Design an enzyme around this catalytic site. Sequence first.
Site, PDB file in Angstrom:
ATOM      1  N   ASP C  70       0.771  -1.243   0.000  1.00 17.09           N
ATOM      2  CA  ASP C  70       0.000   0.000   0.000  1.00 17.09           C
ATOM      3  C   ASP C  70       0.802   1.291   0.000  1.00 17.09           C
ATOM      4  OD1 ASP C  70      -2.787  -0.710  -0.046  1.00 17.09           O
ATOM      5  OD2 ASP C  70      -2.465  -1.632   1.927  1.00 17.09           O
ATOM      6  N   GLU C 197     -11.805   6.946   3.877  1.00 19.00           N
ATOM      7  CA  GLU C 197     -11.995   6.955   2.419  1.00 19.00           C
ATOM      8  C   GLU C 197     -13.349   7.478   1.947  1.00 19.00           C
ATOM      9  OE1 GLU C 197     -11.122   2.834   1.713  1.00 19.00           O
ATOM     10  OE2 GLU C 197      -8.979   3.208   1.404  1.00 19.00           O
ATOM     11  N   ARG C 212     -16.255   4.723   4.655  1.00 22.91           N
ATOM     12  CA  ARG C 212     -16.015   3.334   5.028  1.00 22.91           C
ATOM     13  C   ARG C 212     -15.758   3.256   6.530  1.00 22.91           C
ATOM     14  NH1 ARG C 212     -10.712   0.102   2.561  1.00 22.91           N
ATOM     15  NH2 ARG C 212     -10.402  -1.451   4.224  1.00 22.91           N
ATOM     16  N   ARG C 290     -14.370  -8.556  -3.026  1.00 21.36           N
ATOM     17  CA  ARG C 290     -14.488  -7.434  -3.948  1.00 21.36           C
ATOM     18  C   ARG C 290     -14.762  -7.922  -5.362  1.00 21.36           C
ATOM     19  NH1 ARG C 290      -9.488  -3.710  -1.411  1.00 21.36           N
ATOM     20  NH2 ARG C 290     -10.587  -3.339   0.568  1.00 21.36           N
ATOM     21  N   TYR C 324     -12.491  -0.619  -5.288  1.00 19.52           N
ATOM     22  CA  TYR C 324     -12.937   0.685  -4.804  1.00 19.52           C
ATOM     23  C   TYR C 324     -13.962   1.312  -5.749  1.00 19.52           C
ATOM     24  CZ  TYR C 324      -9.728   1.231  -0.854  1.00 19.52           C
ATOM     25  OH  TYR C 324      -9.091   1.101   0.359  1.00 19.52           O
TER      26      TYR C 324
HETATM   27  C1  LIG Z   1      -2.960   4.622   3.587  1.00 20.52           C
HETATM   28  C2  LIG Z   1      -3.428   3.264   3.140  1.00 20.52           C
HETATM   29  O1  LIG Z   1      -2.642   2.338   3.087  1.00 20.52           O
HETATM   30  N1  LIG Z   1      -4.836   3.066   2.768  1.00 20.52           N
HETATM   31  C3  LIG Z   1      -5.332   1.716   2.317  1.00 20.52           C
HETATM   32  C4  LIG Z   1      -6.591   1.359   3.076  1.00 20.52           C
HETATM   33  C5  LIG Z   1      -6.327   1.141   4.506  1.00 20.52           C
HETATM   34  O2  LIG Z   1      -5.417   0.129   4.710  1.00 20.52           O
HETATM   35  C6  LIG Z   1      -7.629   0.748   5.182  1.00 20.52           C
HETATM   36  O3  LIG Z   1      -8.610   1.672   4.891  1.00 20.52           O
HETATM   37  C7  LIG Z   1      -7.456   0.664   6.663  1.00 20.52           C
HETATM   38  O4  LIG Z   1      -7.181   1.835   7.347  1.00 20.52           O
HETATM   39  O5  LIG Z   1      -7.285   0.172   2.496  1.00 20.52           O
HETATM   40  C8  LIG Z   1      -6.619  -0.438   1.426  1.00 20.52           C
HETATM   41  C9  LIG Z   1      -7.538  -1.452   0.809  1.00 20.52           C
HETATM   42  O6  LIG Z   1      -7.411  -1.764  -0.406  1.00 20.52           O
HETATM   43  O7  LIG Z   1      -8.444  -1.993   1.509  1.00 20.52           O
HETATM   44  C10 LIG Z   1      -6.180   0.544   0.365  1.00 20.52           C
HETATM   45  C11 LIG Z   1      -5.503   1.747   0.915  1.00 20.52           C
HETATM   46  N2  LIG Z   1      -4.143   1.903   0.255  1.00 20.52           N
HETATM   47  C12 LIG Z   1      -3.588   3.190  -0.131  1.00 20.52           C
HETATM   48  N3  LIG Z   1      -4.302   4.274   0.101  1.00 20.52           N
HETATM   49  N4  LIG Z   1      -2.436   3.325  -0.690  1.00 20.52           N
END
Ligand SMILES: CC(=O)N[C@H]1[C@H]([C@H](O)[C@H](O)CO)OC(C(=O)O)=C[C@@H]1NC(=N)N
Lengths: 388, 388, 388, 388
Positions: C70, C197, C212, C290, C324
């Site tokens: 991520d 998000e 979410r 998903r 998403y």
């Molecule tokens: C900063 C970050 O790593 N945000 C995550 C997000 C997150 O892990 C969850 O919401 C939990 O807090 O979910 C995941 C996900 O695909 O579920 C994508 C996001 N990835 C990125 N934004 N790069």
Amino acid sequence: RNFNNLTKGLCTINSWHIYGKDNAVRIGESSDVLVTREPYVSCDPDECRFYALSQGTTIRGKHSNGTIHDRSQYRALISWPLSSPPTVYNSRVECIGWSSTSCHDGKSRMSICISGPNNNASAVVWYNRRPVAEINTWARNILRTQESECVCHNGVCPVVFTDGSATGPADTRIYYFKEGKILKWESLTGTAKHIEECSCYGERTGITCTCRDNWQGSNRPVIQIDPVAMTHTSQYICSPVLTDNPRPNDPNIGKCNDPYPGNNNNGVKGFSYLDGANTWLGRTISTASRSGYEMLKVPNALTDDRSKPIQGQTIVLNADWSGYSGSFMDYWAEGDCYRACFYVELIRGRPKEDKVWWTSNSIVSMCSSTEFLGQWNWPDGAKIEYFL
Amino acid sequence: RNFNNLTKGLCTINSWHIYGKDNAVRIGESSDVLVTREPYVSCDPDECRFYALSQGTTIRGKHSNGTIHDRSQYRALISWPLSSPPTVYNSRVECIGWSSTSCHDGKSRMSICISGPNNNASAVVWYNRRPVAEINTWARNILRTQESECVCHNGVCPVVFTDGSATGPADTRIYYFKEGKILKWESLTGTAKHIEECSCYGERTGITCTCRDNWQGSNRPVIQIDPVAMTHTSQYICSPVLTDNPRPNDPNIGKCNDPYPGNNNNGVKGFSYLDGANTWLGRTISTASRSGYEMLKVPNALTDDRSKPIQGQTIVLNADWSGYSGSFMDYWAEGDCYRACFYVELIRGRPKEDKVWWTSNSIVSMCSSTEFLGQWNWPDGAKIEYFL
Amino acid sequence: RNFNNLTKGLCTINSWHIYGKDNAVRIGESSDVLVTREPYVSCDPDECRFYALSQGTTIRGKHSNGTIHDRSQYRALISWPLSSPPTVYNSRVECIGWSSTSCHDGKSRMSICISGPNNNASAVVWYNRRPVAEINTWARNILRTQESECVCHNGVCPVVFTDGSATGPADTRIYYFKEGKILKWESLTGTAKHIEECSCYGERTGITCTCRDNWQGSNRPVIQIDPVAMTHTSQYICSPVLTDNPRPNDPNIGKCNDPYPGNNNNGVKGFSYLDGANTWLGRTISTASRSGYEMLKVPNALTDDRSKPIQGQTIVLNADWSGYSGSFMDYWAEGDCYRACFYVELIRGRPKEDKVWWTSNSIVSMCSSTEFLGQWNWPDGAKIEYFL
Amino acid sequence: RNFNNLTKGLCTINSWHIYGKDNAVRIGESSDVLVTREPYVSCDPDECRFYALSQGTTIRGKHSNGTIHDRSQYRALISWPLSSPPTVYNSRVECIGWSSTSCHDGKSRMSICISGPNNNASAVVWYNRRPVAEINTWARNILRTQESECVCHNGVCPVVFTDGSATGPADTRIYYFKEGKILKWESLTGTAKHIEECSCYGERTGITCTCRDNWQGSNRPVIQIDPVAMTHTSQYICSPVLTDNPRPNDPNIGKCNDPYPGNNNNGVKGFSYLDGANTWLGRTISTASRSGYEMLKVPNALTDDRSKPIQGQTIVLNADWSGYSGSFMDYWAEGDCYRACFYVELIRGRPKEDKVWWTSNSIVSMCSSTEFLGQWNWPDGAKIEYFL
Ligand SMILES: CC(=O)N[C@H]1[C@H]([C@H](O)[C@H](O)CO)OC(C(=O)O)=C[C@@H]1NC(=N)N
Ligand SMILES: *[C@@H]1O[C@H](CO)[C@@H](O[C@@H]2O[C@H](CO)[C@@H](O[C@@H]3O[C@H](CO[C@H]4O[C@H](CO[C@H]5O[C@H](CO)[C@@H](O)[C@H](O)[C@@H]5O)[C@@H](O)[C@H](O[C@H]5O[C@H](CO)[C@@H](O)[C@H](O)[C@@H]5O)[C@@H]4O)[C@@H](O)[C@H](O[C@H]4O[C@H](CO)[C@@H](O)[C@H](O)[C@@H]4O[C@H]4O[C@H](CO)[C@@H](O)[C@H](O)[C@@H]4O[C@H]4O[C@H](CO)[C@@H](O)[C@H](O)[C@@H]4O)[C@@H]3O)[C@H](O)[C@H]2NC(C)=O)[C@H](O)[C@H]1NC(C)=O
Ligand SMILES: *[C@@H]1O[C@H](CO)[C@@H](O[C@@H]2O[C@H](CO)[C@@H](O[C@@H]3O[C@H](CO[C@H]4O[C@H](CO[C@H]5O[C@H](CO)[C@@H](O)[C@H](O)[C@@H]5O)[C@@H](O)[C@H](O[C@H]5O[C@H](CO)[C@@H](O)[C@H](O)[C@@H]5O)[C@@H]4O)[C@@H](O)[C@H](O[C@H]4O[C@H](CO)[C@@H](O)[C@H](O)[C@@H]4O[C@H]4O[C@H](CO)[C@@H](O)[C@H](O)[C@@H]4O[C@H]4O[C@H](CO)[C@@H](O)[C@H](O)[C@@H]4O)[C@@H]3O)[C@H](O)[C@H]2NC(C)=O)[C@H](O)[C@H]1NC(C)=O
Ligand SMILES: *[C@@H]1O[C@H](CO)[C@@H](O[C@@H]2O[C@H](CO)[C@@H](O[C@@H]3O[C@H](CO[C@H]4O[C@H](CO[C@H]5O[C@H](CO)[C@@H](O)[C@H](O)[C@@H]5O)[C@@H](O)[C@H](O[C@H]5O[C@H](CO)[C@@H](O)[C@H](O)[C@@H]5O)[C@@H]4O)[C@@H](O)[C@H](O[C@H]4O[C@H](CO)[C@@H](O)[C@H](O)[C@@H]4O[C@H]4O[C@H](CO)[C@@H](O)[C@H](O)[C@@H]4O[C@H]4O[C@H](CO)[C@@H](O)[C@H](O)[C@@H]4O)[C@@H]3O)[C@H](O)[C@H]2NC(C)=O)[C@H](O)[C@H]1NC(C)=O
Ligand SMILES: *[C@@H]1O[C@H](CO)[C@@H](O[C@@H]2O[C@H](CO)[C@@H](O[C@@H]3O[C@H](CO[C@H]4O[C@H](CO[C@H]5O[C@H](CO)[C@@H](O)[C@H](O)[C@@H]5O)[C@@H](O)[C@H](O[C@H]5O[C@H](CO)[C@@H](O)[C@H](O)[C@@H]5O)[C@@H]4O)[C@@H](O)[C@H](O[C@H]4O[C@H](CO)[C@@H](O)[C@H](O)[C@@H]4O[C@H]4O[C@H](CO)[C@@H](O)[C@H](O)[C@@H]4O[C@H]4O[C@H](CO)[C@@H](O)[C@H](O)[C@@H]4O)[C@@H]3O)[C@H](O)[C@H]2NC(C)=O)[C@H](O)[C@H]1NC(C)=O
Ligand SMILES: CC(=O)N[C@H]1[C@H]([C@H](O)[C@H](O)CO)OC(C(=O)O)=C[C@@H]1NC(=N)N
Ligand SMILES: CC(=O)N[C@H]1[C@H]([C@H](O)[C@H](O)CO)OC(C(=O)O)=C[C@@H]1NC(=N)N
Ligand SMILES: [Ca+2]
Ligand SMILES: [Ca+2]
Ligand SMILES: [Ca+2]
Ligand SMILES: [Ca+2]
């Protein structure tokens, strides 16, 4: 916008400085670079660009096989940003064909491409990116034109065409265009005996074109055009500094009104700046082949049949392949004079390097300086072995 | 458009935030990314761009072999959109050469490239994308310049050049250009004993350049330029926090007017922001090699020969390769102060990673914040093994 | 140019029509397409573009290995022309980081990227392509934001941030920006128990965000923002049509002010349009993973804890991977109402398809029609086996 | 900007000159060129561009396998610069779908794409790059449209659609759009018995469309549209010079008001310019397959059931593959008349060349000349064996 007028003289040429270089063959070893040949440079009021005839394939593409070929349905005049290589993704097609010229008149650009079979070719004249006029072959033998930029004055842009034999008398015409429309054409007059691939530039005196005699001459024919009266004369560069390729060795007396003999049925596109004591001639270093390139300061070369060099600059070493060369200037630059410029086509591949099956080129370009600058040499730079 | 004037002070620097990063080597493992080195960043009134010296080949191309080489005919100054990588298809060639600088004066951009053999090099000065002035070598020993942006005030853009030995006294000149024309040049004065690769920035006080002493010094020489009077002084950063590479360990007393000894005949391009209590110095973390990068807040570093850090920020971990670094600012941004920025060149390949035959780099760039921001570290990110 | 004001209601939604689709994974099998995830769409007054977080490598590049990850230093927010794929050569970098939002206020665009380690992350706020403000982590636990567009009214652009646990109470803030400057921030209030998000849209009533709950809830939290007063409320969608993933089966009574239980510590970004009888909810078809995507017309879903669907449209078949989803609208389109739009991220690769070592996505996007249009389904379309 | 009005007659057509050619298949052998089919050309007031339906994959990409397929979710209308190939990096997506038309009204461009399953397809009408109107299928059997440019007069742009059988009576409608809004539609009237894929052009008399009867006819149906009254008529080209493919041999008496029999349930998109004594018809040279292309001057072809050719021009040799052809003109060119133009799709791959698994095409395009120009022939130029 107004039409550009040729109101200045040439700047004093004391040396040449690097202007552009695209390293196209080096980069094309691993990038989508189009195979080209017959390149040139031409300026708009706000940008200068590289031009060439694409072969409708990249160098690494299998269709590069056979690109020594001059005339096919897959060729087009393309332009691309200065010193970038001609890529599939950055090249703009100006028109379709296998012989071309192009110039900006201050308001819009005229581009001319010739296509067709040898006995039925035709020119299409584009202006502001639209087709405006068409000219059919008059001698049914490879209608062909400059392969470098034309020059305009007050909207009138003369272009030199030839139709007919490459090895005997042919039918050369000078056309005068305005906004792509034909104002007038006239048959070649004067003492030039064979005319091909004129390289032209303009200044307050008029337009001067240095061409290729493909028949008997190893001196270069010159056409001088008055774009206001729409008339011209022709002769040869008088100087015994001979500038065609291949060519005999330099004698002590040149020829003003006839071909200097020794090499028949061959030649290369070339150029000169003819400006009295400010005269500079370009030529290949080799007398036998398209290798090396040098500039030589030869005072009154046009008119003095005894004239010899008093200064020079090597552009490309004899050990390195050259090719076509031609003139252009940035008519829209600041200052009280026009800075002379030129390009040299650096041909790689066939026929000289036959371990590859393609023929292409890169470009190097220089402009004049009033300084006496140190000289380098400017090879294409690609290693043929990498393409095997 | 009007010429930009340097009318503001530096913003208070309390930390550094990420500004740009191109990940060029990662992406170039499988994309047509040009091999580069000596990168920098420079802003126009409407856009900021990455700059570097291309090597005229992509990384995956076979011509990448041998690109540790500094000076060849295949190099050019290119620019490309902020944080994109330098690709064949998105890079704009500014000029041809192997040493450069470039800056916008508020109306148009000046770019300068030097090319030629070691004993006959020359600078060509471009303004608004046209060649305007040329300067021949004066010492016949690798004429060379900043390798990062110059700075302008009311149309006057000073540039530092050096010609002569890399390992003894050389001939450094400060040139003052306007619209690409030479207003004036002057020989280096002051106590700096050797000057290379100046990194400059401007503010209301004048223009400050932090340079590289390649001869005897591991402290950095500083040139301070008044662009109105067109005069300058020079000395060294007084601080015992030494910022050249390689370098000795930090003593407790630095040197204001002479090289701090310990390492001869080497160095790296670097930078600093010298602003009293708002002073920050950049340096590699390693004292031996171009690895790691950190910023250190060293109050009055320029003038206090006892000054030590009171705050810092790691930019690149010691375990990761760094390289050249230099200053730039967005002179056209909104607000009452100029936000200090810098880039770090992240060199990959030779000489440190010799399983590949190429040398290239990527870029990371930061600007200052008045916040006290958390720090990350910013590696190039490529895995060399993928290129084997 | 003037700041955009939210002066219209939503158009009546009777079905959804295809708006954009980039087929990025199909094309990237043999083109230089960047690996991405967390995409969205956002409009300028003269253009609409695709956005996403690049991973700083192409799909075919060896660095695609490990891109399920991520947060790395090689991520950036990029934008590219509508329905084109995100390529190395056409993508514009907006800022550097691994969590983002972006929106145009009618005059210029604000883009926000967060970067850093988990315990020291920071947001940089860009306006008109320049960094303007920075925000340090307040809870030292993955500062993070919307991953789709923000919305502006009269120059004020609210943005929702969260810092803190993903599996318990966290610290959510609503920031109000103008020209990139912080006007105000406030802590989350209302009955939403966990916020991540947020997908937002604006209309004359104000700004509505559907978010979410990653902690305990499988209903979606909603934040409603008044951009003039700069205040907000929060609750959950009352409807028993649950729209998080994974999630329990739909009950007959939903929850307005607390998480609907059954699935903990997981979720997906999603969206809704809450507009009384014109309410439409998006969700994955699968309750477990998903996969699939559908729109459901659920009158008064926001306020009616018994509300069920009366109309629907399948967007992506259950057999196909989704991901998403979020809201955007073209605030600058002609007409008397704002046409609701959304995108669905179509994730390919890991973790669901582990024969490849990368994770990326393509995009499909729809807007509403007042017609009752026939429905198709819109898969990513790539065959994973081709990448082996 | 003002809406364009059709105020001129056609220029006298005495021959055809080369206008554009992209060599897409040649170049795509080693470049990221998108697989396409159903191409056309259309002009804006300041630029002319190539258009086609992408298949959402490049030719060298593994997803090119199966692209003989007509309708998938991965197709989109794209446009790209004249005579460049349709690449991943230079193609602009106009809308998503598998049947299209597009035209500029003088102020902005309208583009229409149809997508969906056979029984539930829908058209989305875009204007100035935004979706404005949508039309659901009325016969639930492959709603489909022109596959070449529409034409506008004073802001009104008529478009021909068909929904229903390809092998019997179908439901054809003429829609009249302004700024993407539906002004009016009407059911087909007149004597044409089956209508598909209309190729249209406009002049002072009105708009003329030459279409494809896929049911029983090998003569071409014609729809003549008055864009002011928003009414139309239909019939067939009366001439016994039959121009559909496949088709019977030319008889001596054609049919004005019914299909000429011999070949059922097949056809190809084609075009004509119907202008009394200035009438020219296009057709494949082969009567059996999509190979060769020629233009024939057939005076009063529309109305004279005995009319035969008096002049002609070969465009593509019978030995070379052709395909779809259609009309366009540069309504914004200088002069007192509209210069007739056309394109020919040159299909490569399946079904005729089945050693490859893809189907794509390149484009050649010509415009008329008042000169009697020499003719060449214009093959695609790719060697299929290179793709194996
Ligand atoms: C900063 C970050 O790593 N945000 C995550 C997000 C997150 O892990 C969850 O919401 C939990 O807090 O979910 C995941 C996900 O695909 O579920 C994508 C996001 N990835 C990125 N934004 N790069
Ligand atoms: C750093 O960079 C700088 C800048 O570039 C370098 O300086 C440059 O150096 C080059 C190389 O030497 C020079 O190019 C040569 O120029 C000469 C011309 O200059 C010489 O001759 C002048 C004329 O003299 C005559 O007239 C004067 C009247 O006043 C009279 O006084 C004199 O006695 C004689 O009658 C001299 O004026 C001039 O002196 C001046 O300049 C000197 C420096 O050059 C300086 O020291 C002096 O103080 C003074 O200021 C000088 O002597 C060209 O002749 C020469 O070109 C010929 O030779 C090259 C090979 O080098 C060849 O390729 C050319 O084609 C040509 O020779 C062919 O053609 C001739 C004409 O027909 C023929 O006669 C030859 O036999 C030969 O023909 C054969 O080959 C050709 C080609 O293959 C073939 O076609 C034929 O058939 C046949 O086989 C060079 O161009 C630059 O001018 C010079 N620039 C400057 C500003 O100084 C510097 O070297 C660099 N530094 C370092 C360390 O590298
Ligand atoms: C989240 O992110 C934040 C923000 O980034 C992180 O916070 C940052 O943390 C880093 C790492 O610790 C800090 O960088 C260091 O800063 C110190 C300077 O600050 C210290 O010293 C200050 C000065 O003290 C002196 O003067 C004061 C006068 O008032 C006097 O009171 C005091 O007694 C003493 O006389 C202190 O003021 C300061 O305290 C303040 O800040 C504290 C937090 O830092 C806070 O807790 C306090 O309450 C107070 O507010 C603090 O004590 C730099 O010295 C240091 O740089 C040295 O060390 C690094 C290695 O870490 C090295 O690379 C540097 O080059 C340098 O050390 C070399 O050079 C020295 C000078 O010559 C030399 O003395 C050393 O021996 C060493 O030399 C050797 O190595 C070099 C390099 O290879 C070589 O060239 C030499 O030859 C030789 O071999 C760091 O820059 C940030 O300042 C800090 N930022 C903020 C805003 O807090 C936070 O950690 C993150 N959170 C998490 C959980 O990760
Ligand atoms: C050409 O294209 C067109 C346009 O797209 C196609 O037409 C579309 O067809 C689709 C597919 O059928 C329709 O989508 C479904 O819509 C229904 C809702 O409409 C039905 O119910 C309405 C409400 O009825 C109730 O209230 C009224 C009050 O007036 C009352 O009268 C009635 O008795 C009842 O009390 C009806 O009004 C409506 O009738 C109208 O429309 C008819 C056409 O649809 C028409 O014939 C009638 O004349 C009238 O005009 C109609 O009966 C949604 O319910 C449905 O969504 C459910 O089912 C899908 C699977 O198909 C599922 O994925 C959804 O999630 C959802 O079901 C889940 O959730 C429910 C709610 O909690 C739950 O109850 C279910 O058990 C189920 O839950 C399970 O699965 C989920 C998901 O995995 C999981 O989360 C749960 O935990 C659990 O496991 C569809 O959205 C379109 O509306 C329709 N569009 C139009 C304009 O017609 C056409 O088919 C195409 N043509 C061809 C040839 O292909
Ligand atoms: C350099 O370039 C130039 C410019 O391109 C080249 O010049 C061009 O040359 C081409 C090729 O010859 C010409 O195209 C052909 O044109 C003829 C029509 O012109 C001829 O007939 C005219 C009409 O004559 C009739 O009416 C007049 C009334 O005045 C009457 O006098 C006469 O007796 C008769 O009743 C003549 O007027 C015309 O003469 C003029 O032009 C002459 C030059 O062409 C010139 O010399 C004269 O002085 C005078 O000025 C001339 O005689 C087309 O008929 C022909 O098209 C047919 O043939 C081609 C094959 O070549 C075929 O593909 C076509 O489809 C078509 O034939 C099919 O359809 C017919 C109609 O149904 C049918 O009858 C045929 O049997 C045949 O049908 C079969 O095949 C088709 C297709 O597969 C199939 O569908 C059917 O079922 C069936 O199986 C050509 O288009 C150009 O016009 C000409 N251009 C110019 C400006 O001159 C020049 O050659 C190049 N130079 C070099 C060295 O290469
Ligand atoms: C003109 C030139 O070659 N400049 C050199 C520079 C130089 O060698 C030293 O400063 C010594 O004088 O250092 C090296 C270096 O990486 O240390 C990079 C520069 N490479 C390029 N600018 N291309
Ligand atoms: C919507 C659609 O599939 N149109 C077809 C078209 C059609 O099958 C016939 O006209 C019969 O109705 O012909 C074929 C064809 O090449 O003959 C191309 C078109 N392909 C595409 N437009 N994509
Ligand atoms: Ca000759
Ligand atoms: Ca040093
Ligand atoms: Ca959840
Ligand atoms: Ca038919």
